[PDB]
C-alpha cells in the first residue's frame, strides 16, 4: 500500500494519507469538510479500486564460500524490491 | 407371553438331549462326538467355589485337531455369529500385541496404558483362535498362565496390573504332517509341549477316509446347502429359540 481512500458514502470526500510502516490505523468519520460538522456523519470504510498498490518481494543473501575466512559460518541479510 | 410359556412346554420334553445335538449346524454331516462337545462349551457350568481362597475353573476348554481344508473350519464359522460377543483371531500377530498382551508407547501425555487384544474381552464370550504351531515360544507360556487361573498379570514398564479376564478358549491347530499317524500315539502329532496338554481336556481328533459311499452322500449334503433355496432340512429349533432356551438353562446351580 502507498495510498489510501476511505469513503463514508455521505460526502464522497476520499481522505488520503501517506503510508507508514507495516502497521497502521484507520481514522474516524467526523474529520472531513462536508459530511462532518453536522448531526449526521457518514460512516467511513475503505475502497479497493481507488487505492493504487505496488509490488513487493523479499529475498535473502549468503556469501560466496570462497572469500569467507577460515573461521565462522556466513550469515544472511535482508533485501527488498520496489518499482519494477 | 406364550414364548415364556413355550419354554415350559419345551422343558417338559424327553429327547431334547438328542434334539439339540441334531440341530447344531447344517454345515457338517455325521460325527456326533464333536457335536456333543461344542454344545457343552456353548453353555456355562459353575464357577462358585471354596471360601477364602482359590476360585476354581469356570468352564471346560476343548480343542479339535485335524487336517486343514476340511470340516474343521465350519464350527469356527458357526460359533462367532452364534455365541454372545465371541471374537475370532488367527494369532499369527504374536509379537506386536493381541494374543500377547503388550503395552503401548506414550501418546498425547500418557505412557503405560492398557491395550486391546481379543483375550481380555471374552467376558460372557467364547473366544476362538487357531494354528498353535506357527507362533513363537514366548506366548506358549503366556496363554499357559491364562489357562489355569482366570486372571493374567502384567508389570511391564509401569505399575503392576491384575486384570481378571475369565475366559473360555477353543482351538484348532495342525498336525505335524497334515496326515494323522495311526500306529503311533498323539504324543508325536500334538506338536506342542507336554504340560499344556495335561492343562487341557481331550481334543476328539477328526479322522478321514477315501470311501466311495461317504463322498456321494456328502456331495448330496453339500449341494442342497448352496442351493439358492432348498430349505428342506428341519432343525427342530430356531437360532433365537435355542438362544433363549440356554438362557433359561444357565440360571441354576445343580
Amino acid at each position: 500500500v502507498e495510498v489510501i481512500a476511505y469513503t463514508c458514502d455521505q460526502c464522497g470526500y476520499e481522505v488520503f494519507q501517506e503510508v507508514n510502516s507495516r502497521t497502521f490505523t484507520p481514522l474516524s468519520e467526523c474529520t472531513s469538510e462536508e459530511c462532518s460538522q453536522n448531526q449526521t456523519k457518514g460512516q467511513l470504510f475503505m475502497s479497493t479500486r481507488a487505492s493504487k498498490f505496488s509490488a513487493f518481494q523479499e529475498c535473502k543473501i549468503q556469501e560466496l564460500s570462497q572469500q569467507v575466512p577460515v573461521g565462522h559460518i556466513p550469515r544472511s541479510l535482508n533485501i527488498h524490491v520496489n518499482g519494477t | 407371553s406364550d414364548e415364556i410359556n413355550e419354554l415350559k412346554e419345551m422343558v417338559k420334553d424327553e429327547h431334547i438331549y438328542d434334539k439339540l445335538v441334531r440341530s447344531i449346524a447344517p454345515a457338517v454331516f455325521g460325527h456326533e462326538a464333536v457335536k456333543k462337545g461344542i454344545l457343552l462349551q456353548m453353555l456355562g457350568g459353575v464357577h462358585k467355589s471354596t471360601v477364602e481362597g482359590i476360585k476354581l475353573r469356570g468352564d471346560i476348554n476343548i480343542c479339535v485337531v485335524g487336517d486343514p481344508s476340511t470340516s474343521k473350519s465350519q464350527f469356527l464359522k458357526y460359533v462367532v455369529g452364534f455365541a454372545p460377543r465371541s471374537v475370532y483371531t488367527s494369532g499369527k500377530a504374536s509379537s506386536a500385541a493381541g494374543l500377547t498382551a503388550a503395552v503401548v508407547r506414550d501418546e498425547e501425555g500418557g505412557d503405560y496404558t492398557i491395550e486391546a487384544g481379543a483375550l481380555m474381552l471374552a467376558d460372557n464370550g467364547i473366544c476362538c483362535i487357531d494354528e498353535f504351531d506357527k507362533m513363537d515360544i514366548s506366548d506358549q507360556v503366556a496363554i499357559h498362565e491364562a489357562m489355569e487361573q482366570q486372571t493374567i498379570s502384567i508389570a511391564k514398564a509401569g505399575i503392576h496390573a491384575t486384570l481378571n479376564a475369565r475366559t473360555s478358549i477353543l482351538a484348532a491347530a495342525n498336525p505335524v504332517g497334515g496326515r494323522y499317524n495311526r500306529k503311533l500315539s498323539l504324543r508325536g502329532n500334538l506338536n506342542m509341549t507336554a504340560p499344556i496338554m495335561s492343562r487341557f481336556d481331550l481334543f476328539f481328533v477328526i479322522l478321514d477316509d477315501c470311501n466311495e459311499k461317504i463322498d456321494t452322500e456328502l456331495a448330496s449334503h453339500i449341494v442342497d446347502l448352496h442351493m439358492k433355496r432348498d430349505e428342506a432340512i428341519e432343525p427342530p429349533f430356531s437360532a433365537e429359540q435355542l438362544r433363549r432356551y440356554i438362557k433359561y438353562a444357565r440360571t441354576f446351580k445343580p
Binding site: - | 481344508s69 470340516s71 504332517g177 497334515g178 466311495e212 456331495a219 448352496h226
Partner: protein
C-alpha cells in the same frame, strides 16, 4: 484359500517364439469397445440373479466320484465359476453344459502338480529310518551320551537320500517333543533311558 492356480509355461519353442516375434514385428508401424462391454457387465451383475436346477447336480456328482478315484474346498468353488459362466454367456437362467468348461479349467489346474508340505512320500521314509538310527547306538552305548562329531559321521553317509544340514536340524526338534533327547549347544546331548 485360493481355489485354482496356474503357472505360465516357457521353453525354447522355436515355432512359437518366432510367432511371438511376429506380434512385436507388428504394433509399431502406422467389436472391441471401450465402454460398451463395461456397461454390459455392470448392468449384468446385480439385476438377474440366476437359478440352479437338477440338470447340473447329476453331472456334478459324476465328476467328483471319478475325481476321488482337497476334499470339499475344490467342490465349493467349482460351482461358483460354473454359476458365473452360466451368468455370463446366458444372462437368464442356469445351464447344464456350463460344467464341461468348469471341469476344463480345473483339470488344467491339477496339471501343475504332477512333479513335504502337502506331500508325504518323503515323509513316509524320513520318519522311519530316523526312528531306526536311535535304537541301534542306544543298544550299543550304556549311557545316553551322543556328541555332535558322532552324528555327522553316522547319518550323513549311511544313505545319500537325505540332505546334509537343511533337514537334520529340524529332524531333532520333533524328537525334542517326543520324549527322546535334549539340546545342550552345538556339542554334547542327552538321550532316552529305560
Amino acid at each position: 484359500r485360493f481355489d485354482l492356480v496356474y503357472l505360465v509355461l516357457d521353453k525354447v519353442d522355436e515355432k512359437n517364439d518366432r510367432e511371438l516375434a511376429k506380434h512385436l514385428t507388428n504394433l509399431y508401424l502406422e467389436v472391441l469397445p471401450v465402454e460398451f462391454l463395461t456397461m454390459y457387465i455392470s448392468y449384468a451383475k446385480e439385476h438377474i440373479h440366476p437359478i440352479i436346477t437338477e440338470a447340473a447336480k447329476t453331472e456334478l456328482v459324476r465328476a467328483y466320484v471319478g475325481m476321488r478315484k482337497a476334499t470339499t474346498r475344490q467342490l465349493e468353488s467349482m460351482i461358483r465359476l460354473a454359476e458365473a459362466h452360466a451368468k455370463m454367456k446366458l444372462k437368464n437362467v442356469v445351464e447344464l453344459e456350463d460344467v464341461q468348461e468348469a471341469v476344463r479349467l480345473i483339470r488344467s489346474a491339477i496339471k501343475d502338480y504332477a512333479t513335504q508340505t502337502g506331500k508325504s512320500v518323503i515323509q513316509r521314509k524320513l520318519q522311519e529310518d530316523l526312528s531306526r538310527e536311535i535304537m541301534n547306538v542306544l543298544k550299543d552305548q550304556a549311557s545316553d551320551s551322543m556328541s555332535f562329531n558322532e552324528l555327522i559321521k553316522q547319518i550323513n553317509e549311511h544313505s545319500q537320500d537325505r540332505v546334509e544340514s537343511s533337514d537334520i536340524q529340524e529332524a531333532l526338534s520333533r524328537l525334542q517333543q517326543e520324549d527322546k533327547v535334549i539340546v545342550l549347544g552345538e556339542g554334547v546331548r542327552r538321550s532316552v533311558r529305560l
